[PDB]
Amino acid sequence: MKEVVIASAVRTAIGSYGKSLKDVPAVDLGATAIKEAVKKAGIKPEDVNEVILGNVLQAGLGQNPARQASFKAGLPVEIPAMTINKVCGSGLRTVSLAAQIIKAGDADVIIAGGMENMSRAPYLANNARWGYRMGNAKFVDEMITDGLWDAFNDYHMGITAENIAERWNISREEQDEFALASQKKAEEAIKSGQFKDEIVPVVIKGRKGETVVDTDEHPRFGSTIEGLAKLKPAFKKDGTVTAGNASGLNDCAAVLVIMSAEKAKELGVKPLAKIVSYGSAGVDPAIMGYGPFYATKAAIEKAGWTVDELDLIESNEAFAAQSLAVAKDLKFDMNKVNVNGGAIALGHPIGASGARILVTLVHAMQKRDAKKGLATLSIGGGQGTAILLEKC
Amino acid sequence: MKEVVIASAVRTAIGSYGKSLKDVPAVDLGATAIKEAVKKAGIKPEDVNEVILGNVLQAGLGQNPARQASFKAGLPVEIPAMTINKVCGSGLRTVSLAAQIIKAGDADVIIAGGMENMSRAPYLANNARWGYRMGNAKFVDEMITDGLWDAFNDYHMGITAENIAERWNISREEQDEFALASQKKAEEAIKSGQFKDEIVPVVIKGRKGETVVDTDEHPRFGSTIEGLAKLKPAFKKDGTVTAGNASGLNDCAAVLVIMSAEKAKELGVKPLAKIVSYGSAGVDPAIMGYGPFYATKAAIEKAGWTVDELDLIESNEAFAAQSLAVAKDLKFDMNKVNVNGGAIALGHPIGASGARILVTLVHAMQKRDAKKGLATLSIGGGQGTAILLEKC
Amino acid sequence: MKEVVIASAVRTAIGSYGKSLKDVPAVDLGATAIKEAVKKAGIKPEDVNEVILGNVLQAGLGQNPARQASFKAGLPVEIPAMTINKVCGSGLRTVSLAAQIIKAGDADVIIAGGMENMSRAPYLANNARWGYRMGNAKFVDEMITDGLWDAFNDYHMGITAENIAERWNISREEQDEFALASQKKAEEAIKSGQFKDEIVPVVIKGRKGETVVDTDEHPRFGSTIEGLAKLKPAFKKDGTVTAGNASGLNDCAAVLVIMSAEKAKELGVKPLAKIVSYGSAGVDPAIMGYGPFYATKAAIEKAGWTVDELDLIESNEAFAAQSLAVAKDLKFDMNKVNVNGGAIALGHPIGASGARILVTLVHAMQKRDAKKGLATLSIGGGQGTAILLEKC
Amino acid sequence: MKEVVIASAVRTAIGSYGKSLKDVPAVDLGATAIKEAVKKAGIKPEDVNEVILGNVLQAGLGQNPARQASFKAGLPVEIPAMTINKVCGSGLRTVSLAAQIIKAGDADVIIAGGMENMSRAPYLANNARWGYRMGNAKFVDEMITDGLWDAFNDYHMGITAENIAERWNISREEQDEFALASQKKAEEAIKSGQFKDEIVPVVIKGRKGETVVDTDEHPRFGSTIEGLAKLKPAFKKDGTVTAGNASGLNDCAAVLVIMSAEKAKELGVKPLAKIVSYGSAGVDPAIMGYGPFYATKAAIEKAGWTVDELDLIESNEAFAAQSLAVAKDLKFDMNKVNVNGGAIALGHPIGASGARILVTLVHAMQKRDAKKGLATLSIGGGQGTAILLEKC
Structure with missing residues (x-):
């Protein structure tokens, strides 16, 4: 094609x-x-x-x-x-x-x-159209409800990150050191242009x-x-x-x-x-942060690559706990991941984020002459999307 | 393919x-x-x-x-x-x-x-997160804002329909007579199963x-x-x-x-x-109701067909003015259009409507042993989409 | 005076x-x-x-x-x-x-x-002026908040009524029998003009x-x-x-x-x-329904009267538990109390209710040629008010 | 008495x-x-x-x-x-x-x-109880509606102040000089304890x-x-x-x-x-700022005083235009008015304001050994209240 x-x-x-x-x-x-x-x-x-x-x-x-x-x-x-x-x-x-x-x-x-x-x-006032009738109701934070809240488990994406921390034993210390590393790399990337x-x-x-x-x-x-x-x-x-x-x-x-x-x-x-290839995958909502594992593996299969063949990876950082679990299971060389910082440092503008890491990936590929690249990120409700790039 | x-x-x-x-x-x-x-x-x-x-x-x-x-x-x-x-x-x-x-x-x-x-x-309250500070504000009807209001011209979809009634010289009588026939066809279709x-x-x-x-x-x-x-x-x-x-x-x-x-x-x-084929097109937001003219023409071209070849047509009825303008310019045989009634009778559940007319078209094709079918509808912001079906 | x-x-x-x-x-x-x-x-x-x-x-x-x-x-x-x-x-x-x-x-x-x-x-939205910042909030029913909720104990007036049913040992049956008689008297009064x-x-x-x-x-x-x-x-x-x-x-x-x-x-x-005389008194907010005991006693004392002297009595029916407690402790002849029905039948339009019962008492006094009358009611936050009337 | x-x-x-x-x-x-x-x-x-x-x-x-x-x-x-x-x-x-x-x-x-x-x-959302049905509505600033808005003329108390400025010809310059004088006096009063x-x-x-x-x-x-x-x-x-x-x-x-x-x-x-005495009075809502004229004159009559007998006056300053019109018509010696500053400087906490100027008046009377005092202020909806004090 x-x-x-x-x-x-x-x-x-x-x-x-x-x-x-x-x-x-x-x-x-x-x-x-x-x-x-x-x-x-x-x-x-x-x-x-x-x-x-x-x-x-x-x-x-x-x-x-x-x-x-x-x-x-x-x-x-x-x-x-x-x-x-x-x-x-x-x-x-x-x-x-x-x-x-x-x-x-x-x-x-x-x-x-x-x-x-x-x-x-x-x-939001969800019952303003036909009336509340009586009683206090919820004045709804739309950002939380539409962006940050699991529809099935009735808790924050933050709790999905705790679930992965608990299941994989990713400690607070480990999560903090990854966050620190993301901060330092983003400072160096901004200051170096x-x-x-x-x-x-x-x-x-x-x-x-x-x-x-x-x-x-x-x-x-x-x-x-x-x-x-x-x-x-x-x-x-x-x-x-x-x-x-x-x-x-x-x-x-x-x-x-x-x-x-x-x-x-x-x-x-x-x-x-x-x-080169792409793929999305679903996982239990309760561990949505792990979606990129399965999306990435499918994308790598379709491309006929290995993880070790990758020159640069952008793996989003909505939470250190989920980035670390994905990283551990796919066995990423962490020196090739989020080389300019990730989202702990840079931010996570949800509907733009997946495009943002791809923009970052492709520019890093050009600047560093890195031939093979992966972009991947977790999705609330239990999904993942991944894309593989090869530099022209 | x-x-x-x-x-x-x-x-x-x-x-x-x-x-x-x-x-x-x-x-x-x-x-x-x-x-x-x-x-x-x-x-x-x-x-x-x-x-x-x-x-x-x-x-x-x-x-x-x-x-x-x-x-x-x-x-x-x-x-x-x-x-x-x-x-x-x-x-x-x-x-x-x-x-x-x-x-x-x-x-x-x-x-x-x-x-x-x-x-x-x-x-909705658009400024509740950071505060109104002082003065009355708009309590926003989200259905109108997100569904029924033109983002560019600051008026209702209904004004886009009036723009078309005016520019195409479609009378109140023409619109009412079209609406009546839709009601008549809908009654007969429901009652006859x-x-x-x-x-x-x-x-x-x-x-x-x-x-x-x-x-x-x-x-x-x-x-x-x-x-x-x-x-x-x-x-x-x-x-x-x-x-x-x-x-x-x-x-x-x-x-x-x-x-x-x-x-x-x-x-x-x-x-x-x-x-068989499909397509979407854009048009001036002020006359969005005419989107189906351009979308239908593109899909027909791609399929290798003509309008005269069509056996059944689902052309949505958001407003009689726009259905009439489209139908006049595409020269539809109105005997073959919305044979079971249209949205003036049936309703226009916006996000579902495009799928609704396609569901209705394919069941009508099976029942009436009709070979070639067309579903199309107008889109706020000046767009249209069309799909062409051929009975198996 | x-x-x-x-x-x-x-x-x-x-x-x-x-x-x-x-x-x-x-x-x-x-x-x-x-x-x-x-x-x-x-x-x-x-x-x-x-x-x-x-x-x-x-x-x-x-x-x-x-x-x-x-x-x-x-x-x-x-x-x-x-x-x-x-x-x-x-x-x-x-x-x-x-x-x-x-x-x-x-x-x-x-x-x-x-x-x-x-x-x-x-x-109401209590934090719309300066902003919620983040998170769901209360959309506040102003009728409940300003009219029906105890500011000090954080529960409904209805709980104050239960406190009185409990402390005075007033049964569900006693309360229903009182409510029925109010309904019976109200029907008869409306129908007889x-x-x-x-x-x-x-x-x-x-x-x-x-x-x-x-x-x-x-x-x-x-x-x-x-x-x-x-x-x-x-x-x-x-x-x-x-x-x-x-x-x-x-x-x-x-x-x-x-x-x-x-x-x-x-x-x-x-x-x-x-x-002839009047008075207001306070009482524990938790048993606000009993306010009329102290207010009636003060007004009776001031007028030089006794409860036994009274010909007609309007003792409001916010809740049967409180009407019953008051009536028991003041030893009212219940044949003379709310002769045309009370608020369980008629309603309790809060800001008007005190005036409502007085309007009803004075017309009842004129019609029944009754010399001495008493209007009293309970007040959220632990108060009662009473007025004594003498027919001209 | x-x-x-x-x-x-x-x-x-x-x-x-x-x-x-x-x-x-x-x-x-x-x-x-x-x-x-x-x-x-x-x-x-x-x-x-x-x-x-x-x-x-x-x-x-x-x-x-x-x-x-x-x-x-x-x-x-x-x-x-x-x-x-x-x-x-x-x-x-x-x-x-x-x-x-x-x-x-x-x-x-x-x-x-x-x-x-x-x-x-x-x-406030005034129709949240039984529903808005359709259409944008007002998200109501309760402070403005309940505190600052004329119920009869559907405009701000500010427009009542313009009406008095226009009728009496109180200029912007005059209004500004009175404001300046109020500022200077409040600075001197705060700094001097x-x-x-x-x-x-x-x-x-x-x-x-x-x-x-x-x-x-x-x-x-x-x-x-x-x-x-x-x-x-x-x-x-x-x-x-x-x-x-x-x-x-x-x-x-x-x-x-x-x-x-x-x-x-x-x-x-x-x-x-x-x-010594007191009095309230009504005026046309449209010139509510002038209410104190009539309340003050009634209070002075009841006390058998004259305006010239007053040692100290607190005449509220919701707007310079209304203070100046009251002052002009009652012929106040302005050296005895708001001697410690007024509300242009100090603020106008509406439901406290009338008590605030009385507190200020009585303390100034004690500190300055001033025998006779007046407190007066304007009321939205067209009223005035005044009180006369004589030092013990």
Whole structure:
């Protein structure tokens, strides 16, 4: 079938909760990233066949957030658009969907990725339409309910991370040392300019002129193991998961131009990487963090690779406990994993996250001349998605 | 490419706003439909490779409503699921997506369709997280915001219908006469059993007994042109669009088992219809109701067909103005269009509607021994989707 | 001191929760009652010196609900008004307040009483101004919070009633038998016209016609002991208090013109009754239902009277447990207590209830040619109020 | 009749909106002030006959805020309590009510004043009980609706201030110079310790120990006429009322022990002042700010005084425009008015305000040996209350 390539890969900076991007809707973050992805790919907007974007906290964002990002990016109205929700999987899944659509023969150029603004999530009154009748009710945190809460087990994704910590015996200390390592690598990557190629600035029109956001603000520079050790468990009494060893609540968009190799050649595009294979998998909701194990193994099988053949891995860090369990079971060389930091440091903008680590992966591959790459991440409700890349 | 077939096609009854399905979440409607779809295909839950469902008003429904429907239907945890939002296109677009993933070589059996419960949509407070500070604010009707409001022109879908009535010179009388015929056809179809095969019952089991819902309650039996002519305009002073010549706000799930022809043969399945081609297109948001013109033309071209070749046509009735504009410009034989009634009578459960019309089209094709069929509908934000079926 | 008299005494019908008065704000109920009170006293609006009304659930009713009732009743702007909240005592305490201000030499004519619409109470978000930050919160039922919940012990008024059933050893049977007699007396009183004089009609004039409300709808005609015995406990596992032996959640206004004897004589008024003495007392919040014991004893002492001297008694029926405890300890002849029914039948519109029972007592005194009367009721937070009347 | 005296007069500091007292409920501010008023009066809690406290934004504060302040102050439960709402009038009106009750012969010792926490006011959903049905609705700022909004004219109290500015020709410049003078006097009074006798500290138990609030934080020290002149109108295009010439939204409690002179002598109390007379009056809502003119003139008549006989005046400053119109018409010597600053500087905690200026007045009278004093203030909905004091 057709070969599928990444023509460009761009993200906004990742903002912290209620901070740098609090005033920028997800659709606007998306539009910004789309405009720049298309420029960087060296194609025209008229060349784009479809827009397929991840977004989880869609509540009150208005009809079809992907369509809104497309329109605001100034793409032609004739182009179809759809919004995909697979929780954290969403931004990665839109890229393998783009690959599938190209392999099916129905398109040659797709805008894919995702966008999230967790700072802007509303609160909900679920029975305001027909009435509460009597009695106190819940004023619902939509970010938690739609993004962070297991629908089957009625607890936080944080408890799924404790379950993996308990089952695998991943200790608090181990979780903290991985978090520390992620912090240090993200500081070194930011300060050394590793992310300059991939970040599109966001311009915020305020009262007095404008301000530019172009740097990932979530990392805690000069983090220490003592500092991490003082934190209290965040999710349960006497637990192991804290604020310091889990990611935050974050805002971002990450967008990729995906194309058939044939069209890329026809338009003079110099692709970054070939998408070699992909796969998604389900696991018990109760241990959703382990989803990447099974998605990765299936993707590696399809590609005819081994884990040891990989040059660079992005394995998301929603929680140290789940990253460490995946890492342990797939036997990753940890020196090749999240070489520029992971989500404990950088943030976890759920519907963008899977696209964000793919953007990070492909740019690291280009900069470091690393031939073979994997991107993978866990999904609430018990799933995983993985993609394999080979550099052009 | 592999050939792609519809193995089964099931829907719940369509409920009216605040009425027969008000106490049934979209994900439970979804699960009832899935469970019965699998049964009717003559396959086992284990035979399903993926679950792709439409759902527009996801607010507060929790993580990945498709996954929740899957799980509640008794489908294995290993099966990946994702939720699609293409506004009213959602339930139809999941089906062409399924065909694309099977054509790509990645699955053999997929649960597709959509689900919606508009009666259950919440109200939102957009600034409760960080605070209002001072002054009255909007308590936001999420159903309107996320389902029925144009994000770009800041007006209701109903104004887009008026734009089309104005630009195409479609009169109030033309719209009422179209609405009356839909009501007439719907009454006759219900009474003569046309929908009995396709409708799975919904059992509502409250604290003290049970209630079976298995009939479409939205039709107004004994409708008259005089009744319709008396109605007040719904969207603007002196408008042509009314409650009587537009659909309602409705609750439904509609689900299809989609398979490769090869796998259907391997599993002993007698498929209902082959998916011959499909397509989506965009159009000015202000005249979104015309999306089906461009989408139908693209699908017809791809299939090698003509409009005159078509035996049965499901062209959705969100508003009579848009159904009429589409039907005039495509030169449909209206004797072959919505033969069992359309959404003005039956309802328009947005995320499910696209799947609903396809379920209705394929059962009508089987019953009437009709070879070639077309399902298409308009999409808020200026889009349309179309699928062409050929009877097995 | 000046002698203080009741010139007129009027009330609306008492509506049931979510029923006949749901569309009538408390301040409009108030104005209808005021307008008719002035008329029935045979005075002019200009003769009124002040407006003092009870109202408990003031949330979102706007500035000074008493003033709004005054203005809407057609009373002059020069007349001062204030709104009193003594929970259920409010409507009775405004009357003793009026007597006190006239005794002080500061007015001759005062509009007193109370008003409530519990059906219309809002829900609240307590942290929307400065923000929730994260997590589900309480969507607060303001009717419960401000009207029915003990601020000190963090439980419903219904638990205070259970405390009294327990400490006084008042059985479920005693409570049901008391409730049945109230229902029996209420039916007989309505049917024989006992309330026709005191009730002013409420005209509801909507978009398309009108609806007169002029009958107390809360009574359950044909009540039986078997019916009552079957009921589930309302407040606690194995409780004695039920929906059948407690009052409801109700809507009413009740207003009295209070004057000096001197001014009534100057203006040609034939007063209904003299206010002989009054008093309020406190008690442990946990047994608030017993407040009327201490308040009645204080008022009786002040008047120079005895309980045995009383001809008619209005002792409110918020809960049968508390009515029974009070009546046992004061040794009331129950043949003389709530002769036309009590609140278990009629309803308990909290801010108006104290005025309601006084309106009912004085009309009963006039009709039955009864010389000495007593109105008293319990107050959430552990209080009681009592007024003693002597027929003119 | 009995002579009525002020035995003590105490207030909390006045906090700014969302600032120093944001975490202290009104009832807690009240309890603090009550405890200290009783100590300073040199009586026992058992000597107190009734509690009568002003509070306007009662929404969700729970049953009978006055009762809650009483209980939390540790006053005996046998003592009756009630909450009074006359908008800004409330805290002053409770003192003349206390006087009336004493003159009536029903009590000898009353706790009076008021409390407000505008920072803590909720938002409201008025139709959550029985349902919105469809459509966006208002998420209501309860502080604005219940405290700051005319119920008859459907605009802010700010527009009533513009109406007085326009009718009387009080210019922006004049309004600003009065505001400047109020600022300077409040700075001088705070820095010179004028308020030390009257302020009770509020202790806030936080995470790390506690913090004390004991100073009025609203004043803007080093205010200038240029700074005031730069502000934009706050209420209407091209208006005269700004943030700098109107008071804020503020938090406070102010409480007084009111007694008959006879009881004061019997208990060894050294009273501060005699309450000579009082009066309230109504005016058109549209010019509510002028209410004090008519209340003051009536109070002066009753006392047989003249305005020129007054030594000290507290005339509230909700808006410079209304203070100036009252001042002009009653011909006040402005050197004797608000000698320690007014509400433009100090704040306007609505339900406490009338008590706050009385506390300020009586302490200034004692400190400056000023024999005759007036306290007066405007009330939304078109009223005024005034009290005359003569020093013991």
